[PDB]
Design a protein around this ligand. Sequence first.
Ligand SMILES: CCCCCCCCO[C@@H]1O[C@H](CO)[C@@H](O)[C@H](O)[C@H]1O
Ligand SMILES: CCCCCCCCO[C@@H]1O[C@H](CO)[C@@H](O)[C@H](O)[C@H]1O
Ligand SMILES: CCCCCCCCO[C@@H]1O[C@H](CO)[C@@H](O)[C@H](O)[C@H]1O
Lengths: 332, 266
Amino acid sequence: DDDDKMLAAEAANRDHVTRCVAQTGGSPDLVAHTAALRLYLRVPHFLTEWTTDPDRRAAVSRALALDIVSMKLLDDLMDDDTGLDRVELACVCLRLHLRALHELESLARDPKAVTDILEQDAVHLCGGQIRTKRSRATNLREWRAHASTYGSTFLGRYGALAAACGGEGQPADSVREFAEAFAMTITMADDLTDYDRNGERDGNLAHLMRTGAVAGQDVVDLLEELRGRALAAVAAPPGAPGLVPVVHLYTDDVLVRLLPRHLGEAGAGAMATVKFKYKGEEKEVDISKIKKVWRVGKMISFTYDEGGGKTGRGAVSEKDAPKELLQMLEKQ
Amino acid sequence: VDDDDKMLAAEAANRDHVTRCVAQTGGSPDLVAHTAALRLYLRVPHFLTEWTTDPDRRAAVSRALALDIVSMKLLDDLMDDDTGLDRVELACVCLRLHLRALHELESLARDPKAVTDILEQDAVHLCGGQIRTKRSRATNLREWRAHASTYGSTFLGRYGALAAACGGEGQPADSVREFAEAFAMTITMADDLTDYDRNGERDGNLAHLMRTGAVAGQDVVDLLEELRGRALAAVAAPPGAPGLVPVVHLYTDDVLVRLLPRHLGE
Ligand SMILES: CCCCCCCCO[C@@H]1O[C@H](CO)[C@@H](O)[C@H](O)[C@H]1O
Ligand SMILES: CCCCCCCCO[C@@H]1O[C@H](CO)[C@@H](O)[C@H](O)[C@H]1O
Ligand SMILES: CCCCCCCCO[C@@H]1O[C@H](CO)[C@@H](O)[C@H](O)[C@H]1O
């Protein structure tokens, strides 16, 4: 049912946005383009998760949807590659944005709160976007510094806005920290998806990965860092435990579905190995060399490839058996 | 000492506030010079704040208005994509200026909410209006003035309403707006009749219609006189802004004396 709320909020946000876009005169095209922004349309649901009143929640949620979409249209306008009419984009972008300011301001805890948040880091956001397209990233550090502006800062502002407009019990800093961490996970997913869906290369993370400039394991660590930051934010009282599955879902999808498309054969960080003594020795073998493996009580017995058609042998306690070895077990 | 010295200083102050903001947010020299070349856009806020007595408040409202008007102008350059400027810079500087203006205007308004109320009020009329203008070009004075009332009149009308909401006591709000709406149409015509040669502009362009006979000189003269009268009236309502009277005459007469002759029928 939390999943049913999510869907219904996304649908309500989609509705609010498309009606507003058609009434301003945008084509059925642009209308389809915006209704297609499913995550952008659902994110407002996550940002408003700390809002106790449901009537305020739905109102804040769609107001955020209006502005997030408007900013996405602005981005479409700067790249001019959607096929969409430049004029309807411009005009629809502005219109949604003014509607959003009106709605958010009508729900804010203070009359200056909305414009303070939008102004506070406008230079960081705007100059940051310019710099992102002016100097393509060539390593993880650069890719990350750029993504913290058009991804993190970008969504963080909406996080601050959700807290500013969501009545009582909103832990301002936490909603915003959730937003900035979640935005980066989402931005990464996007780069690794759009490498192909879109044909993107310069400054793109999937390209940097396929190119060697950034290593799989460092991407896993950043994803893990972002997961932890988001979980902590979501844990600060009064808590938004409903966001826990959400954070896992997105992080895990990047790890399980998207990374492999750019890392290949076991793109972790190191070929797993098994250590053991055999005939007074000290041996270590790559799970890749391992042929057969079976269990005798709590011991794990196996055979492997030494060099040529030279069959090696070994047995270890399961406690010293790397997960990878234990898997060939159940897989044998 | 005179009003001309006040106008010139305001324009300069507006230009500098604008260029400093464009440069700090990453705008390049071509984009910075481009915003400094929008002369009338930087000057018009001086006219709209003419009812504001306190000179500090006036200078502050005037430059905040200049930020947003420049912003909308960059967004327009962005949709037409014909200036040869970087679309990312235009877009980003556009947003930055607009957000700074919201912030400066809300800090000056009696009631902050009034700033978003005014901008929402006729957002559809202005944005849907700008789409149709570009969709289907004007073919006669009727159609031309209907379109200009959106991207010209409503467009400046809003800033007129903002100048009143942010300019303290006095301000006869409906009149400031009426002045802005009529004056905006006069300069939009002016611009259209300069833009002919300076843009390779034909469809829906008033000068094109004039030269091809679709529009009659006397009707244009009439429209200009109607606009002058409406503007003179707006500035004579109380409290009154006498300083705008010669301004209304200067721009109207310039269109009648210098621009129209450039466009006889055939
Ligand atoms: C109503 C607020 C301003 C709208 C009318 C301004 C149109 C005339 O403004 C003119 O625009 C030209 C083209 O960009 C510039 O080259 C000129 O310097 C400027 O004076
Ligand atoms: C100056 C304008 C800044 C706003 C542009 C970025 C805001 C939305 O832009 C979007 O950002 C996403 C990350 O959230 C990217 O993954 C998408 O490719 C991009 O469309
Ligand atoms: C969607 C609304 C954004 C654009 C609104 C109009 C912004 C100003 O647009 C300007 O207005 C002038 C007024 O005469 C015209 O002459 C100029 O050619 C035009 O660029």
